[PDB]
Design a protein around this ligand. Structure first.
Ligand SMILES: Nc1nc2c(ncn2[C@@H]2O[C@H](COP(=O)(O)OP(=O)(O)NP(=O)(O)O)[C@@H](O)[C@H]2O)c(=O)[nH]1
Ligand SMILES: [Ca+2]
Ligand SMILES: [Ca+2]
Ligand SMILES: [Mg+2]
Ligand SMILES: [Mg+2]
Length: 166
């Protein structure tokens, strides 16, 4: 069956693990345990196609930035996550996109911009600002909440649909 290699990237604490675990395991991780690098696999049907999602949950702590090159080489599609209550995390997106662009030597890498924690009211990144960033990258913007599950499947499945346009 077709396999899709997804990689979830973004600053520390934005909810990469919580999103991935919500998708794969259907529960919300409330506690905060920083990730080094974990892998998840699951067979799922997306638009009629049985496929295997292979998902890499990466480190947001800058200490582990040396590991990015390796996972960017291997990944087919990138979920670029910030939190809508973390302006700095939104600004950090560009450094991830730029490295992906270098490593892939490509301006057309399958990606989806994700504004997570949309259940929280302390928003400092408005939808339109993120829409604009995604537009400049040629990619979709989707808001999510790992806590409520809002948008979670949509974000990951959209990334599969972007890889398929590639
Ligand atoms: N309210 C709310 N809290 C969230 C959401 N996603 C994550 N959190 C919380 O934010 C904290 C960090 O989540 P986590 O998934 O561990 O972030 P991370 O991006 O994987 N961290 P790291 O980069 O260090 O591995 C946790 O306490 C988690 O419960 C969300 O959608 N809504
Ligand atoms: Ca829980
Ligand atoms: Ca692009
Ligand atoms: Mg994590
Ligand atoms: Mg503002």
């Amino acid at each position: 069956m077709t396999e899709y290699k997804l990689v979830v990237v973004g600053a520390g604490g934005v909810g990469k693990s919580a999103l991935t675990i919500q998708l794969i395991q259907n529960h919300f991780v409330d506690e905060y345990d920083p990730t080094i690098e974990d892998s998840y696999r699951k067979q799922v049907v997306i638009d009629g196609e049985t496929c295997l999602l292979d998902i890499l949950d990466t480190a947001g702590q800058e200490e582990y930035s040396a590991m990015r090159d390796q996972y960017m080489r291997t990944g087919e599609g990138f979920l670029c996550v910030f939190a809508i209550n973390n302006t700095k995390s939104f600004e950090d997106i560009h450094q991830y996109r730029e490295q992906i662009k270098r490593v892939k030597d490509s301006d057309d890498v399958p990606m989806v911009l994700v504004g997570n924690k949309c259940d929280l009211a302390a928003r400092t990144v408005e939808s339109r600002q993120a829409q604009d960033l995604a537009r400049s990258y040629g990619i979709p913007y989707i808001e999510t909440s790992a806590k409520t599950r809002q948008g979670v499947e949509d974000a990951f499945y959209t990334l599969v649909r972007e890889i398929r346009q590639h």
